[PDB]
Nucleic acid binder design. Structure first.
Ligand SMILES: [Zn+2]
Length: 793
RNA sequence: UGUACACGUGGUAAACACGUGACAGCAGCCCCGAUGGACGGACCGCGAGGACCGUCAAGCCUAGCAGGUACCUUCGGGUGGGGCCUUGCGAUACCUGCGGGCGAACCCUGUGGUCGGGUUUGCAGCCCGGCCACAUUUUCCUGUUGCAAAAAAGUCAAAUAAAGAAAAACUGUGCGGGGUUCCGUUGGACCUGCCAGU
């Protein structure tokens, strides 16, 4: 039943989110939320035949070997290198069964000797060799088995054993400097700047330019086993290493796990499997070969520097100044791919041509299709809007911009079965830092960034049901200052440009340094600096611009968020927005956010600009005949009095729990009849001759919290008779040992600095206890609001 | 291009001349993203803004994106509204396509002519949309599927099935009971009755 699959999908996504956040977020963003809908039938019959298809690649030719031509490996594995390899352990279990524990428990020497024996024999056990493959729909509405994706997961020991081999390959034989894809530094670091400099130069000096982008799709599904084995054999690497790779690939199998249904193993006829740590290094050797097969004298002369190819993660951006120049380059790429089995998406590859014309001083754009990939024509795109050289969030071949693909991601996140805080976190730390690279490879304006920010804010407002008139700084202000900390692409793009392009001239690359001394790059740097200065405030400590201070300055100066200005001094106050979100339910988070920025609809806040009516729209609905502000509702209203005592006692119970856990003799509601009047302390506790009178207060924040704390600190500790009475009751002789103490929390859930410091210092409570008091304050306040709004008489 | 300043040349000095110059600076800050129009009237404090009533055929808005046309320039480039000032060298007219929201059609389904699309392969399939033609009405109660948060409340005819028929209060480290908030033996929420009181 559909409800059953929805149940299973929700459980699976929640478990994945609890275990590993990054993989779950990356799966949710792409669209892996609907699961499989075609079952085993008409699914194995489509994907099984496409797997055991050995490519008839002839292999590299003497010409390719000579173009390539233009020892410490297999060393015994020691125990230091095992921990020298950086491994991400928050991954999925293999089909064998060992998830992380049976592999973590074994000592290092045993694993080292096991790998040594494995390479001595050269045979990975079939049980450990076995791997599974789950299916992922591409478009949000699957229509056929060809619209899915076979993500394959291998065993943990095999991934660990290959990671050290990949590290050895990277250290022993580093790639060419042109290869800036799978590199130690950031891949698309200088490649974005080089293309921009080339485009600026070709427009400036009216130089003939043609830049083509062609991607390596099915590059996982097109490398022939024999071709790669021969390539590694002729590279000079040990022949037995190649034999081991050939034995690994020739003896391979795959299990189809669709709807938890077992399936027989299936042969694979094409090499390079997805997710293996050796795959992006082995494919780097193919990149080295294809780059070495490029024609020698061809490219674009950018300031005495010749630029021809800038390899991206899985792309190949070729450049040429002459129309005939790139045709032979493309033919060479085609023959290299065909001789190795690689296939190219003519649909997803594009060519940008730029032909100048004299006697007019303008520059002309070609429109018709001229170049081709072995006969198949290449589409010609006018504007450079295919800045999708960012890896994930795959391309659309110039059909759409970067938007209309961000909105798809937002819809995929919105429809996924996640709590309102989980979507917020996924957008915070997995979507914004993912497409932000794409908005720098070309000319950009402020309006595009502002519209992207507005769309993101609209999506977040829909997720958390906030009204329209909420301070826009609330979304982008940092957590410690009070806010959702949604990073804003309006100010983080100039920040990225300034931070990266500023250090362009310090890059080891010779091409990047040439690109640094350009005209367009410097103009963009000036624009980015201007925007950053306009959207930041200089830091007092370090004299360096920061956007967080600017967002805080706007937020604390607003009307809704003025009461939050005291939250930046005690980071515990806003510990529930981001860190402690797994302990708070779904609707609870939305209610807490609503009362946190005072988005609750009152007769004052909910009628902004629409107060042309009578006093009934402004007078308190309880008959208090005063202004109906949310502070009045939540703090001073006779209908809300019972809820106020309820919340107060809810807090005093939890703090009493804490001090009891800290081994203090507590006394609830002491009864002291002073001669002056009636004094009602909250709770007293004494230990080893010293006592304290701890009273609990939840008060508004429109005044300073510390002063309000002092107003009862002095009253309870300087009465002159009450301290003697509590000293006599507790059993301590000297009245100066006992002194008053308060726990003052603003009803939005903001600690008081003096109160928090006193409570931490006078009596020992660990951080988790103080973390939960804002939760109690917010819950009590919103329950008070619901109690008030439940009836209207 | 237009202001102001650094050096050099020449000169007895200049309120004299020229050239070269920090990416030379000097071309201020702040706020604003709502949405259908033409013609005729009733509303409003007839005031900035917000209601409604009549037709029209489809388009109407956009400081959103991309490309070209002309013009101003100065080479860098340039086209929304409002405010505070302050001196504090800038720049407009439209059409084309895409996205957004307001319209408007469209509408129970199967074949074919279709056309734009995606996806494996070499025009063989699956799926997304747009034109051209085909196939009694009202009326209550059991099963199948689309989203709400949980083993159930919403969906009484969303589509349905010789479908089976008819007409034409609360105050609480209180107490008891259950696959239900989401937590890895606890915690807030509602469901009930007693416990000392109002
Ligand atoms: Zn009141």
């Amino acid at each position: 039943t559909s409800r059953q699959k929805r149940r299973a999908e929700y459980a699976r996504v929640q478990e994945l989110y609890k275990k590993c956040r990054s993989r779950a977020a990356a799966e949710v963003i792409d669209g892996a939320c609907g699961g499989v809908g075609h079952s085993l039938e008409e699914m194995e019959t489509y994907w099984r035949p496409i797997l055991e298809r050995v490519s008839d690649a002839p292999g590299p030719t003497p010409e390719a070997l000579h173009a390539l031509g233009r020892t410490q490996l297999w060393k015994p594995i020691s125990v230091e290198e095992i921990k020298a390899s950086r491994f991400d352990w928050r991954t999925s279990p293999g089909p064998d069964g060992i998830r992380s524990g049976q592999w973590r428990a074994v000592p290092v020497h045993l694993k080292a000797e096991m790998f040594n024996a494995w390479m001595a024999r050269g045979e990975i056990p079939e049980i450990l060799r076995q791997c599974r493959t789950v299916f992922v729909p591409k478009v949000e509405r699957p229509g056929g088995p060809g619209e899915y994706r076979p993500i394959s997961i291998a065993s943990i020991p095999l991934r660990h054993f290959h990671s050290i081999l990949a590290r050895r390959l990277l250290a022993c034989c580093p790639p060419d400097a042109r290869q800036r894809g799978f590199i130690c530094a950031d891949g698309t670091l200088e490649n974005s700047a080089v293309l921009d400099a080339v485009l600026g130069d070709s427009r400036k000096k009216l130089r003939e330019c043609h830049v083509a982008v062609l991607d390596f799709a099915k590059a996982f599904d097109t490398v022939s086993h024999e071709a790669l084995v021969e390539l590694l054999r002729l590279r000079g690497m040990p022949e037995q290493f190649c034999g081991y790779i050939a034995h690994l690939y020739d003896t391979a199998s795959t299990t189809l796990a669709v709807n938890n249904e077992m399936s027989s193993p299936v042969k694979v006829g094409r090499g390079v499997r997805q997710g293996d740590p050796l795959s992006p290094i082995l494919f780097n050797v193919v990149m080295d070969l294809i780059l070495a097969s490029l024609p020698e004298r061809v490219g674009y002369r950018l300031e005495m520097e010749l630029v021809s190819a800038l390899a991206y993660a899985y792309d190949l951006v070729l450049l040429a100044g002459s129309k005939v120049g790139m045709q032979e380059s493309i033919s060479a790429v085609d023959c290299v791919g065909r001789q190795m089995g690689l296939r190219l998406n003519c649909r997803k590859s594009a060519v940008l041509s730029m032909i100048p014309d004299g006697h007019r001083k303008k520059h002309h754009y070609l429109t018709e299709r001229t170049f081709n990939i072995g006969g198949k024509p290449l589409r010609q795109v006018s504007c450079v809007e295919r800045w999708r050289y960012l890896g994930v969030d795959f391309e659309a071949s110039g059909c759409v911009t970067l938007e209309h693909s961000i909105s798809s991601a937002l819809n995929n996140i919105s429809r996924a079965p996640l709590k309102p805080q989980q979507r917020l976190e996924i957008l915070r730390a997995h979507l914004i830092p993912r497409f932000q690279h794409g908005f720098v490879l070309g000319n950009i304006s402020d309006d595009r960034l502002r519209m992207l920010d507005v769309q993101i804010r609209k999506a977040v407002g829909q997720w958390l049901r906030l009204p329209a008139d909420v301070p826009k700084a609330y979304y982008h202000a940092a957590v410690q200052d009070g806010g959702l900390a949604i990073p804003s692409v309006r100010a983080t793009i100039p920040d990225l440009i300034v931070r990266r392009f500023g250090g362009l001239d310090s890059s080891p690359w010779s091409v990047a340094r040439a690109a640094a001394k350009s005209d367009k790059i410097r103009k963009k740097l000036r624009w980015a600096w201007k925007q950053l200065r306009r959207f930041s405030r200089v830091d007092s400590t370090t004299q360096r611009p920061s956007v967080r201070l600017f967002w805080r300055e706007h937020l604390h100066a607003s009307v809704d968020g003025r009461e939050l200005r005291e939250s930046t001094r005690t980071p515990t106050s806003t510990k529930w927005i981001r860190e402690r979100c797994a302990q708070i339910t779904g609707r609870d988070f939305v209610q807490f956010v609503h009362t946190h920025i005072n988005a609750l609809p009152s007769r004052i806040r909910g009628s902004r600009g629409r107060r042309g009516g009578g006093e009934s729209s402004l007078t308190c609905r309880a008959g208090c005949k005063v202004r109906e502000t949310t502070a009045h509702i939540l703090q001073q209203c006779h209908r809300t009095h019972g809820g106020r005592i309820l919340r107060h006692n809810k807090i005093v119970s939890f703090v009493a729990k804490a001090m009891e856990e800290n081994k203090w003799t507590v006394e609830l509601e002491p009864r002291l009849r002073t001669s002056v009047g009636l004094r009602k302390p909250a709770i007293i506790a004494s230990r080893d001759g010293v006592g304290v009178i701890v009273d609990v207060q939840v008060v508004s924040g429109q005044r300073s919290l510390d002063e309000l704390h002092r107003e009862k600190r002095n009253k309870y500790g300087n009465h002159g008779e009450l301290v003697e009475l509590v000293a006599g009751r507790l059993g301590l002789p000297k009245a100066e040992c006992v002194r008053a103490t308060s726990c003052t929390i603003s009803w939005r859930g903001v600690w008081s600095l003096t109160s928090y410091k006193e409570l931490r210092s006078i009596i020992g409570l660990r951080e988790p206890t103080l973390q939960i008091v804002p939760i109690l304050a917010l819950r009590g306040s919103h329950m008070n609001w619901t109690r008030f709004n439940q009836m209207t008489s």
